[PDB]
Amino acid sequence: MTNKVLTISSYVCSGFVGNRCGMIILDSFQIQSIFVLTTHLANHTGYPVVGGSGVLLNDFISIMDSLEVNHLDKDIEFLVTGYFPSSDLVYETINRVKRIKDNKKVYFLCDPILGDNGKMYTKSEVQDSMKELIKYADIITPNATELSFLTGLEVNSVSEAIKACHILHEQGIPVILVTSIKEGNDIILLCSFKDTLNNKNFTIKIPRIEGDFTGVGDTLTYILLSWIIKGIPLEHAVNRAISTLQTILRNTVGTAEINIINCIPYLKGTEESFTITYI
C-alpha cells in the first residue's frame, strides 16, 4: 500500500463530477490515490440550487502540509488537477507541483476545468491562473471552450484546434488532448504533440450522444489516466477511455448525471471502438 496518485479537484455529495469521478474510477482500477478536495458541494452547478463552499486556502495548505510531513505523498508518480473555485488554490498548487517534481519524476495531467459550450463555470480569476498552471503539466485535457480561453483563439474546427495547441506547445506543454471539438453531429478529439518528429498528432471522430454532463469530461480524464498508469500507450489509452465513456452514455437515462455507479463493472473495458486518424 503506497499512494501512487495525488488528485486535486472538486467534490459533490450527490452525483459525479471531479474527484468523485476520480474516486469511483481510480478505486475500480485499484490505483491507490490521495483525493484532495477543492469544494464540498451538495451537487453540481447544473441543478436548480447549489449548496456548500469551496475549500479555503488555509485548509488546503494544512492538508497538503500534513500529507507531506506524514510521508503520504512520498511515492506519488502521477498528479491530477481539475476544478478550482478560486485562484489562490491554483497558485498554491503551482508551488506544490514545483516541489513534488523537484526530487522525482511525476507525471502531471492538468484537466483545465473552466467551462463548456462557449460558457465559463469558473471565476474569471481562475481562468487567468489556469494559464499559469498548465505550463507545468506533462499533458493537458481541455475541451474546445477551455482551449479557446487558454489561447485567445477560436476553436471551432480541428484546423483551428491545431493552431491553438501550437501556442501552448510553444510555452512548453508537451501533449494536449482536446477532448471535444464540434463537427456536425460528430465530436472530434485531437491529440497534439510539441514534438511531431517522434510522435504523430491524431484525431478520433465519434458520434454525438445527445447530452449534457460535465462529468463526461471528468470521467474521460480518469479512465485515460488509469490506462496510462497501467502502461497502455497513449493512443490506445485514449481510444479505450472514449469507448468506455460512450458505453456509459448509452447506458445513461437522464441528463442530470452520468450513470457511472451502475457502470462500475464496465469501467476497465478494453474495447477500442473508434478509428485513430493521423495527421
Q: CA end-to-end span of the chain, whole Å?
A: 42
Rounded CA-CA distance 68/70 in Å is 5
Q: Which of 40, 169, 194, 236 binds a copy of itself (CB under 8 A)?
A: 40
Beta-carbon contacts of 252 under 8 Å, excluding residues fewer than 6 positions away, are 211, 213, 258, 259
Bridge partners of 6? 34, 79
Give me the least distance between CB of 11 and Mg ion, in Å please: 15
What DSSP assignment string belongs to 59-88? HHHHHHHHHHHTTTTTT--EEEE---SSHH
Closest CA to 36 of 2, 62, 1: 62
Does 52 interact with a copy of itself (rule: CB under 8 A)? yes
Rounded CA-CA distance 130/132 in Å is 5
Number of residues that bind a copy of itself (CB under 8 A): 51
Radius of gyration of the chain (CA): 17
Does 217 interact with Mg ion (rule: CB under 5 A)? yes
DSSP 3-state assignment of 143?
A: coil
Does 18 interact with Mg ion (rule: CB under 5 A)? no
Does 37 interact with a copy of itself (rule: CB under 8 A)? yes
Give me the least distance between CB of 116 and Mg ion, in Å please: 6
Rounded CA-CA distance 170/134 in Å is 12
Does 63 interact with a copy of itself (rule: CB under 8 A)? yes
Does 212 carry a binding-site annotation? no
Give me the least distance between CB of 122 and Mg ion, in Å please: 11
Give me the least distance between CB of 58 and Mg ion, in Å please: 27
Does 85 interact with Mg ion (rule: CB under 5 A)? no
Q: Which three cell numbers stand for residue 66?
A: 500534513
Does 234 interact with a copy of itself (rule: CB under 8 A)? no
- Which positions lie near Mg ion, rule CB under 5 A? 113, 217
Binding-site entries: 10, 45, 111, 116, 141, 143, 179-180, 209, 211, 217, 246
- Which positions lie near a copy of itself, rule CB under 8 A? 1, 3, 11, 13-15, 23-24, 27-28, 30-32, 34-37, 40-43, 47-53, 55, 59, 61-67, 69-70, 72-73, 252-254, 256-257, 259, 261-262, 264-265
Binding-site entries for Mg(2+): 111, 116, 141
